Amino acid sequence: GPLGSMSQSNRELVVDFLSYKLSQKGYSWSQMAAVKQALREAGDEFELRYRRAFSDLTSQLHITPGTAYQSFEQVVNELFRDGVNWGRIVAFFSFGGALCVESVDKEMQVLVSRIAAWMATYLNDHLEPWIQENGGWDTFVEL
């Protein structure tokens, strides 16, 4: 209810802020917190080192609502065609975030929630077995 929700939102804001400040000092709130910001950092580094190539490829995106899923699916299934690796997983997140940014830029904000669902499913059904075989996200954090 609305009363409980204000309590929950306050708690979430605190945890978010403390998690961030811990991370700035090489510490972490929790294992999941460490994963989230290893991923944020890895994506930033990927986009920074490969700014020229990543900018270029994202510039080529042609999105409409009726073709967005087809596009997302063809790109990710090609990305993983010959296997999975941690670098490809980072590329996958970076690509999804770029797809979202493009969608909002083009006044297709409706696609943002759709892309998030498509990615979460992809993680569950395509990528999870490899991730689990390769030491889970904690291994990505160490790596």
Partner: peptide, 25 residues
């Protein structure tokens, strides 16, 4: 405009370069 196949090959290419830097084969 480059087709989705080109976008994906370019994305995988740099994902692989990024991987190779950090991860042992």
């Amino acid at each position: 405009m480059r087709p989705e196949i080109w976008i994906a090959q370019e994305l995988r290419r740099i994902g692989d370069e990024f991987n190779a830097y950090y991860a042992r084969r």
